[PDB]
Specification:
Shape of chain B: elongated
Distance between the termini of chain B: 44 Å
CATH topology of chain A: Outer membrane efflux proteins (OEP)
Radius of gyration of chain A: 37 Å
Strand content of chain B: 5-15%
Number of helices of chain A: 8
Largest sheet of chain B: 5 strands, antiparallel
Subcellular location (chain B): Cell outer membrane
Structural class of chain B: alpha+beta
Number of domains of chain A: 1
Protein name (chain B): Probable outer membrane lipoprotein SilC
Order of helices and strands of chain A: HHHEEHHHEEEHH
Largest sheet of chain A: 5 strands, antiparallel
Strand content of chain A: 5-15%
Structural class of chain A: alpha+beta
Order of helices and strands of chain B: HHHEEHHHEEEHH
Oligomer: heterotrimer
GO molecular function, one term (chain B): efflux transmembrane transporter activity
Helix content of chain B: 55-70%
Organism (chain B): Salmonella typhimurium
CATH architecture of chain B: Up-down Bundle
Number of domains of chain B: 1
Main location (chain B): membrane
CATH class of chain A: Mainly Alpha
CATH superfamily of chain A: Outer membrane efflux proteins (OEP)
Helix content of chain A: 55-70%
Distance between the termini of chain A: 43 Å
CATH topology of chain B: Outer membrane efflux proteins (OEP)
Chain lengths: 437, 436, 435
Amino acid sequence: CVSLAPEYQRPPAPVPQQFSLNSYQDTGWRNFFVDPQVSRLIGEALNNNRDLRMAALKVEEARAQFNVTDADRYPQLNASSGITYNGGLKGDKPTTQEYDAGLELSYELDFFGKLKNMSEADRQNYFASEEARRAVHILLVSNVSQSYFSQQLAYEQLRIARETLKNYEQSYAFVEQQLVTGSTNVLALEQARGQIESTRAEIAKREGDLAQANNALQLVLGTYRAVPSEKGIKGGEIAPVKLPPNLSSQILLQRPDIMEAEYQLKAADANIGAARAAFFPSITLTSGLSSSSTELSSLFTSGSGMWNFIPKIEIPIFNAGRNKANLKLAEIRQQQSVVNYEQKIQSAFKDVSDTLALRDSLSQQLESQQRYLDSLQITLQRARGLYASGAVSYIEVLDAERSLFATQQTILDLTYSRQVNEINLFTALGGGWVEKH
Amino acid sequence: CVSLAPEYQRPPAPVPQQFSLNSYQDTGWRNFFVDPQVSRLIGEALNNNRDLRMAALKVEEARAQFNVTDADRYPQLNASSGITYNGGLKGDKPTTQEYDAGLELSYELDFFGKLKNMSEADRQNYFASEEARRAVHILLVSNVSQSYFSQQLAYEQLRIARETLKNYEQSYAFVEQQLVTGSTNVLALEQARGQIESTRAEIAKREGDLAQANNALQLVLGTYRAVPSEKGIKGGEIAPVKLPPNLSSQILLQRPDIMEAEYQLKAADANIGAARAAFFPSITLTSGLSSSSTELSSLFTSGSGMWNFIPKIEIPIFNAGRNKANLKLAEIRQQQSVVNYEQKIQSAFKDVSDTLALRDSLSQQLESQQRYLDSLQITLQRARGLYASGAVSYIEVLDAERSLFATQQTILDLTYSRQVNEINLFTALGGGWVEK
Amino acid sequence: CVSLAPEYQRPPAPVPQQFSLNSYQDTGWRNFFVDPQVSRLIGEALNNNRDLRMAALKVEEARAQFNVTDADRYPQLNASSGITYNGGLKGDKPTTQEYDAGLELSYELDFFGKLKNMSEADRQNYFASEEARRAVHILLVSNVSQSYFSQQLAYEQLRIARETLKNYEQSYAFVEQQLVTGSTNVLALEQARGQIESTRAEIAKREGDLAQANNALQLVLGTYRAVPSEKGIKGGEIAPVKLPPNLSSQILLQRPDIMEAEYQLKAADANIGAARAAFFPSITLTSGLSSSSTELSSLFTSGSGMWNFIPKIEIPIFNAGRNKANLKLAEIRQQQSVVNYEQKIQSAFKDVSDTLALRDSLSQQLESQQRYLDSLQITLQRARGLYASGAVSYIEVLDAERSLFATQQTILDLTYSRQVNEINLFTALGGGWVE
């Protein structure tokens, strides 16, 4: 037996050896997700999400497809019966009757490994479909957690808007009482009435956001049981990934999408092997045991049984270069598989490089926003103080409250961005496949 | 004749029996779309949109594909002629001549329903393609209407921007005359000059928005006639869907995309039946009337005509488990069709749930925004009154006009969102198929 | 030989003959891109981008696919040997042994142009893949330039945020010194402190934007060399497309995506021709030279060689309408190809009509925004002057500095939009194929 396929070489990864930025290990996704709710929802989804269900069925499709293709490599047994009537149109020559029954055993030698390479291309494609399930798995893990964290964000935003509204209602009362007794103008009161109605809208928007974050969580879960409520604890929900000083691009090579591109690349080599076998001769055995007769009474008698054994070898000589062209197709597609591989790596490298950058951008953003917060709370208290003594008009109170609301909302969105980014680093690195080191 | 395909069972829908939230009926899209312009554009688009045309062609593809596959079930007739020359290379054996003409009639019995099941898979796939057209149809309706409503929004936003601009020019005058006569500061006047130039920029943005809304409305129409102008009447353009107290998820099951997933699920059962037939024997008839000769002179003479009749039965015995694996493939793919069905349902249920919630979220937003509006108009008149008497600086007028503009634009965007949401509920329920 | 395929007619383009709005010419993308950096990065990308690499390999696939299909039109030569054993089960008939070797030359006539039309459909489909490469090429140009320009925007936004921050620190100093000596209140000082910390946040956000614009620029280049820094000069980086008074829709018809739809429309005609050939007879020649024997000793001897020559003609008569249904499928898919063609045109026409609109929308936006800028700078100076004399409170300075920062950022975003829009017009018209 011969395999004409080429030896596998892994293409060199077309990315820097390092990200810009002791050893990175995959501690399970149980370490990463500190919050026990996201642990429970992942567990729930892992058994009910329809997309992961399709991904597993696709692995099964590919295993069955390998067994369909591998069957060709094995001997084959078939039986057939038949009557043959035969006469002339004018001549009185009586009409014949030929009864026949047969058992035939076919077998392709495959001395140059055409069928053997085609089964291997399908073996490799099954490995590809397995890594594809894994990629679907860790992306599921990502969507579930982000969906939960997004729901929580809706819970906070709704809650602080309710709280602002009660704050602005007290402001209106503060202004109301000084107008019953002539200290202020009525412009302050209409400014305070504005804020109340404005904030009322916001609460309506945030309720809608919360409704929609619930429905999206339940879609990804695949089950519709009671959605989680708001957590009373804030902070520490995620344990970020610890990265060594100089980190290697090689980490990307174990990603599921890249591994899946690697297995398809292997499958394309095997197809090159089958393309090349197409040039060489083929050897086919075909042995048979038949029994023919002229009346049905003696079909399975002694003088009728016959055996047969035919080895055959066929060779191609001139096909107007069909075999060439089909070899070029193979080799071109293989180069396509190389390109596809490179593409999966280069994007992989971008993604990670981005989240690393975002890690620092978002930290500094969030800390400087808290500082702007603290300064805004002092501004607001001073503005209320000086307005209560007639030193400044109420627009200074309005501005501070406004700025303060915007900043509280942005800080909430920021820590969200922060921990989703952290999830995104986890996932781009190989993600939530393993759950226990 | 036997059919090995399985009996159809509809998969139980993996969603709550009810949405959270007398009987819902599909009154035609003529009742839903109150505005007669959206009705007239829908008519134009129903006869000119290329995507709908492609969807209908895809239905015809599928009917032709069924006829190609059904042909195998019928007897087949073919003729063939031929001369055969035959001689030896060294041995003096005079070169022979065999003239032949023949007429053959082939016919697969299909006793176990292999070909019959494969034609049925293609029947089912044609029904699928019909539900697909329908889905493209109602989605066209949704895109046309939102496209028109979006244009109209662009018209309003542009118009009130122009109106604001004339307002702020008058403000500039109000301040300008008090500076010619020394009552105010020049800081007011640069603040008013500022607003004017700002608003001038906004008008440019909104004109751009109107231009692009026009082009998108003509793309979706597929005809490039005169686009609709702005409506003088505002309100009542849509008659929302009236929904019963407790509403059933079952409504989703008549959605085109879900029905299309169902027909494909039927087609996969048929393929399971063909997979199974592959194990059992096949019986093939093949009768023939030929005529051979050794000189062309007597090809169609009396002593040459011959007839033939060969029934044949072939059986598989050991294929190294190819038939098994091909059956596993069928069953696996069938489960894939079940999963695909469940996915279309779960999504559909999410969508509807979202618009129901959005229905309440958008009404309450819009009403509280109008109340902020009203309060802002009082604030502006009071800031303008107190500024004219030296009680507050002009920054209080600036803020009021600013907040007022912003709120007017949000209210415009809100009612848009409101009525597009309503369109979205219509469509997610079964939508603009019927107009009766 | 006969071709049953139909004559090609180009479908009339279903769009206005004119865009609403001397002669347009495609000056190379070297004229359009004034900035030498974008020219140099395009060169680097044209030799390293993986997507253009894949588009090329797809053209090679298509040519190979044509040679696979074209082989059927030529005579074919094949050889085969074989031994045949033959015996009875119970009858004492000695077991036979028949040795054979053979050389067969097969040839399909194709009198009605079935194989010929099917090769032609694949010729057309290779032309299609060529136009697809071209589309991928000009889209590569568009992505490379917008990536660079986007990077530059990140650079400016970061820089003016750093500069605003030094400004607001000087404001804080200005306020600090009047509170050390009692002239003002402490509300001004906490207002200025706020602006400082706020702007500190913004700087953090702009640094993150810059990093991400670098990584996306390196992805599209396909090489990871030192990214370009900020340009000290601003302005004149692009030379817009000069457009004649009344411009014709016909310009669209040379777009790659539409040409690719056209070639596929041609390929569907050829398939109609093969569908119709299916009805007519087929004529096949098959000549042979074989040599058989009964013992291997004399396999290639004198009495064994035999020659052969069999012309055959096969006719379909009743196929339960398979050939008809296969013809309808062809014709239907051809109408599909027409519709696909129309769709590619109508979208092309929308796109161009949009960038033309946007050309005017963005120029006016940007011009009025500069005027608002100028007016805001006067407002700020006046607010600071009247605050320093006790005439207005500091909030008036706050507002002006705020309004001014927002307007500086929007003007930056605007000229960006302006020159990307211009790139988008170039590309929608045929774009960066020629230099």
